[PDB]
């Protein structure tokens, strides 16, 4: 009774076949890069409008890699977008060394992981590899973890 692993290990894709959720009814304002956190700025007709994470926002999900929706290499303004709201996913990071297992991550500007000492939110899942003179980490996203401030 076990969960299979997923082989390609690139940023912006899913790392396991555990319970995951993909919110595919969204549109982008500005440009978004695969493997970055996004935030919900508004809702029109059951569609969520997302943008790259600013300072002071609450992350909602992580952009997901697809080879039909995004032929350019990144997500462009006015495009339908895939966003992962629950599951394990490879994220871009600016950190230098792996944090403690099962710690709480903190997101800098642009939707990159820079902290490992948060109070509550998403947690580190134990994966840490290297990409392009930069690193990739593995994050565990949960649905109601970050709550929008009143």
């Amino acid at each position: 009774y076990e969960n299979l692993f997923l082989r390609p290990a690139c940023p912006g894709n899913i790392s396991d076949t555990s319970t995951y959720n993909i919110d595919g009814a969204c549109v982008a304002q500005g440009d978004i890069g695969f493997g970055s956190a996004v935030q919900v700025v508004g809702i029109v007709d059951g569609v969520k409008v997302v943008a790259a994470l600013p300072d002071g926002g609450t992350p909602y999900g992580i952009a997901f890699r697809s080879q039909y929706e995004h032929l350019s290499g990144k997500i462009l303004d006015g495009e339908v977008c895939n966003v992962v709201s629950h599951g394990r996913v490879w994220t871009l990071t600016s950190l230098g060394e792996a944090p403690s297992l099962f710690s709480k991550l903190q997101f800098g500007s642009g939707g990159v992981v820079t902290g490992g000492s948060g109070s509550a939110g998403w947690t580190f899942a134990g994966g840490f590899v290297k990409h392009e003179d930069g690193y990739i980490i593995e994050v565990q996203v949960k649905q109601n973890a970050f709550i929008a401030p009143p």
Binding site: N21, I22, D23, G24, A25, C26, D45, G46, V47, F64, S66, Y68, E69, V80, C81, N82
Partner: protein, 53 residues
């Protein structure tokens, strides 16, 4: 002119005291989606009735 300006039907047995009829309705929506999604919206239906004497 009450029996000539309005239709007269005969589909009622002489020994009946009440009659009932049905009406129905429906709701739903559709959205623009991408290739990988799991948030397809749903639809439903309704019903109700009235009476007579």
């Amino acid at each position: 002119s009450a029996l000539r300006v309005f239709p007269v039907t005969t589909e009622l047995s002489p020994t009946d005291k009440t009659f009932e009829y049905m009406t129905f309705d429906k709701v739903g929506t559709a959205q623009i989606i991408a290739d990988y999604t799991d948030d397809l919206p749903l639809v439903d239906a309704l019903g109700t009735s009235e009476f007579g004497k």
